[PDB]
Amino acid sequence: KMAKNVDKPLFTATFNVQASSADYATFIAGIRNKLRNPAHFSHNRPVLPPVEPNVPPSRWFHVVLKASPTSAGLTLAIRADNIYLEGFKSSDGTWWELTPGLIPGATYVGFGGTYRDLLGDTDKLTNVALGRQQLADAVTALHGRTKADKPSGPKQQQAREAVTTLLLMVNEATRFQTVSGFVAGLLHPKAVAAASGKIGNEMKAQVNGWQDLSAALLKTDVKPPPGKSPAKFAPIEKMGVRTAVQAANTLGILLFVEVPGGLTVAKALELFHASGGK
Numbered sequence: 001k002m003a004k005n006v007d008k009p010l011f012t013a014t015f016n017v018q019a020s021s022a023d024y025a026t027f028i029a030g031i032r033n034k035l036r037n038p039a040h041f042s043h044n045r046p047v048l049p050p051v052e053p054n055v056p057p058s059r060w061f062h063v064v065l066k067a068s069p070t071s072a073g074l075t076l077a078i079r080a081d082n083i084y085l086e087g088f089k090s091s092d093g094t095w096w097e098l099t100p101g102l103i104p105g106a107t108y109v110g111f112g113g114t115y116r117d118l119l120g121d122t123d124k125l126t127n128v129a130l131g132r133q134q135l136a137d138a139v140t141a142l143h144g145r146t147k148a149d150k151p152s153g154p155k156q157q158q159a160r161e162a163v164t165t166l167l168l169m170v171n172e173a174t175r176f177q178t179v180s181g182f183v184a185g186l187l188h189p190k191a192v193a194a195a196s197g198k199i200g201n202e203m204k205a206q207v208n209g210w211q212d213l214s215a216a217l218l219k220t221d222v223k224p225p226p227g228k229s230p231a232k233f234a235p236i237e238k239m240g241v242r243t244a245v246q247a248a249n250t251l252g253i254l255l256f257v258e259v260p261g262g263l264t265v266a267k268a269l270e271l272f273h274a275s276g277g278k
């Protein structure tokens with residue numbers, strides 16, 4: 001304790017909830033691009049820099065979701081090292097937080113940021129509806145939160161539903177091309193009927209095994225010992241991911257993992273800084 005720089009993002013990505021599917025894809029791609037360690041890719045997918053050892057989380061960026069081109073943002077506070085959502089900012093200026101005492105002068109929303117906290121189990125993910133209206137409503141309900149009012153059970157219930165929706169349509173979208181592609185597939189022009197959708201089991205598993213999938217691809221990059229054949233990608237069948245090429249098409253941006261024979265935390269951060277990363 002406590003978190004550092006929440007007020008000073010390394011960049012801000014902005015999205016208009018009424019904008020085109022292509023603009024959403026551009027929005028997501030830009031986040032991954034700005035998060036990347038320039039010195040570390042795996043199969044031409046970006047890898048996040050390691051989490052800095054011996055300090056509290058000090059690298060953040062903001063995402064702004066807007067009702068319209070001129071509306072003011074619902075601001076999300078997200079870690080630039082593991083893309084964790086920890087805070088959001090309502091219209092009256094109140095930073096709300098998902099971890100007690102994490103963010104400077106923030107107010108604990110009343111519930112945790114984990115899928116078990118928000119839903120009740122990691123396997124309820126395949127029940128959450130996403131889409132343009134779900135996104136807009138989630139943005140509204142959060143941005144409409146005021147520093148005064150009674151955390152009614154009903155109000156909390158709606159709020160957990162909202163965070164679950166945005167985590168999926170922003171955070172998990174940044175992490176996974178499957179998720180981002182799914183969300184982009186839900187976004188249509190006005191001339192198309194409104195649409196909703198829930199992620200399938202492969203994406204649920206992917207979302208629940210980001211570290212595992214990241215680590216699994218990272219192992220294929222390790223150069224092998226003498227006399228042993230080089231490493232083969234090891235399938236995560238529940239994820240529908242059986243090959244390295246499939247893993248690369250699935251990963252939006254990889255979490256940094258220390259794998260045996262791969263980059264260490266110190267070394268990857270060293271390469272990150274040498275390439276101009278901040």
Ligand SMILES: Nc1ncnc2[nH]cnc12
Pocket residue numbers: 083084085086098112113114115167171
């Ligand atoms: N609170 C949270 N923030 C970011 N990613 C998450 N994945 C699951 N829960 C999350």
